[model samples]
Target: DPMVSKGEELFTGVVPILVELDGDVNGHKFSVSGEGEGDATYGKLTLKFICTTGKLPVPWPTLVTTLVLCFSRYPDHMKQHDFFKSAMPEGYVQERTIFFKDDGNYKTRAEVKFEGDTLVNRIELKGIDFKEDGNILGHKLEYNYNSHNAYIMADKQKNGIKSNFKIRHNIEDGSVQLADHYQQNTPIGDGPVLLPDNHYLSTQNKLSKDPNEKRDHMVLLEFVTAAGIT
Candidate 1:
């Protein structure tokens, strides 16, 4: 139907929607984006023979997994997409643990949902801090990939830092609350940090929000520290 060009690459025919993902997982710096059809962009032909797909490598399990976790929320559009239709199977649903490559390694155990086999509904990755009210040392943190929201609470001051922060996003609007046990004010070094989807925690912690007001790129989490607040 509509053809597009980027730099030197030229598509003879077919329209395209760009998709990208970037971030870390347990100190592992990784990025996922789509380029050509052979790259991470999962493409499929529509009934009219128009090629459609996401940009990312197929070998990276997370490419398709991302489609299941993040893209699934917008069923209206994704369900109608040719790539999603082919990637997801027909009339299927269930939750299971996905062992990537290693059997004895507990870190490889990934939480996932499925309909039949090809379609993943949701996925909770292992390692780092992507869980419900999970504990890092003594602090509490909650990250929901399904909804793209995160919450954290520190009952007491840790390393001279105390916090109770939460950030969530809707279709077009999102909210962030930074407070503590006794008051609702901004903490110095302690605050909610935005993380890329499917990513884990990092060293940086500061009060930040999705400046663009778009929820498709990031999630939130609590960051408590004893020092470094100005």
Candidate 2:
């Protein structure tokens, strides 16, 4: 979503991540490769980076990306949403929105403002048991509705961790407060810049409360992708 702007056209389902290398750390070539999808898109990302400097060590886990978003186009909004046939046409028109970005990557960066009014909703899928009681919703095309994104989290669990779904409303950042131990850094800014500050803030260190937790190895992903049936 942050990778491109309104009216930007994407090609296939797998949007490739522009890999970055930090030269050689401890005499080993370090590299990162990533990709993203359209299904369950936005506010979500997947990344794979060089971890070891020696020979082959172990296998990385599969990816599952939970999301946050504001969309204007879907099968309902399109003139012809023939899923098994053609892709969505470029410049597909949508309602005017300032913060409600529909081009994917709702959580790629910290782009917030006095979005005085907003609405959102999501339906939790069947079969998968959520980790929380509030992570349950079944509304569609709802207006002025919002959900506390990232209640359940991405599919590919890092560090073998997971979160229960959180079917919630827009939380007042000023109202409910974070814990004393919860630390926050600068929110990621707009525009392309290689990486977001919390690029590595996945299950690896969900809380980062542990003083010894290694919170440096990042796995940030850029979203320039598509590919579902439609």
Candidate 3:
């Protein structure tokens, strides 16, 4: 039941935010931003958290219950658009690095780092298209939750992507103890076969788009951990 306990802790910490903030904000008027940093076997994991706030006419209790149901019923969509999780070895601590796109898109990129049973660091970047951009996009910065608290910083561009995302934790140490990465091919069948010989098919396919393709690609990353207590 340790996994159940971990699940309960995670749900208690995260599900409430979805309930409390769901549809509360009108067009991103009020926003919550935060970041956290912690040490992991691999290295330090920095996380960013951003939430928007507003008001819903419905009662709080009703909203919370309904939101929970929605989340449970459509876990794939909810996790894809809102949360992220992945599997890891037993007794390992996990951490995640989350990135959000500039526009109001729900796509994100996440890197999950975990402590191996041997106490070494093992990290994986998931939902990432290395074939497309050759690198993850977003600003490069350090997060310190203890000294800095949690606050919103200006949106900045790096590696050819704009980001406005925040990170949170559910561990006792105030650090992102678990990181999980999920990777999969595009659901839409990767579109047409634009280039036959290209190794990075996504990039080649994208390049085949009209010269004025202005749409920004969205990415999401999730992290999950396994119990490591000996």
Candidate 4:
């Protein structure tokens, strides 16, 4: 019980601040917030989303749509420009992630991390091969921020530089069985930092209560229709 209590405290302590920094409280509706830090000195960069719908089987479609729009870079900026707005159907949950570098001026990578079922309507949404790991559900999508020209700093100035938007998804679940193998490390650094086989196993835990309980009661999943950043 102590561990659960501790987890609750940890979730509670950060959720409010994170929500305020990356959320919007409309009259009776709420939505997650997304923003970037121009001066990237402290790895404070992040993209965040929140859903107040209190229900199981959280809306995966809306969450996926938001994830794509907030983190994806549009080469044409025209094609698929309205993809996020159009993809999300009704009754869906939402979430977000904050990306940063451990020791660089610009974030070499970006990820929208979350835990959930990998398949929707029995369809693989993110190109994940499920047959290899049938129960592979939990995910952590990552993006290589350095691949784009916009992220590269000018001449000799690397400080306070930011990367162009990109998107990725990482998933895990009990169904994924192997001889001590895991997909990626904990995003602590950009290099190929090899993580211990049991590192992820040790990090496994659960939340006794949903993080959004205090905000709303019903699991409302209407499309965002329209939103903006200040």
Which sections of candidate 3 miss by over 4 Å?
1-90, 93-97, 103-118, 127-230
Question: For candidate 4, lDDT tens digit of each residue in 1-230?
Answer: 34223322222221111111122111122333332221111111133333433321222221332222111222222222222212222111222222211210110122322223111111111221222212222222111111111121111121111223332222232221221111111221222211111100001111122355563222211111111111
Instruction: Please provide, for model 1 over 102-214, each residue's C-alpha lDDT reduced to its tens digit, 9 standing for 90 to 100.
Output: 11111221222222322222223233443222222112222232212222222232211122222221111232222111111111222221111121111121222346633
For candidate 2, the per-residue lDDT at 117 reads 23
Give the C-alpha miss distance for residue 110 in model 1, angstroms.
Answer: 16
Q: lDDT of model 3 at residue 126?
A: 26
Compared with the true structure, all predictions reach lDDT values of 0.23, 0.21, 0.21, 0.21
Residue 216 miss distance in model 1 (angstroms): 24
Instruction: Residues 1-230, candidate 3: write the lDDT tens digits.
Output: 34333323333322211111223211322232222332221112233223334322211211110111111211221222211111222212222233223211122222222233111222222233211221111212112121111111111121011112233212333434111211221111222211111111000000111235233211111122211112
Highest lDDT scorer: 1
Task: Select the stronger candidate by TM-score from 2 and 4.
Answer: 2
Estimate TM-scores for all models: 0.20, 0.20, 0.17, 0.19
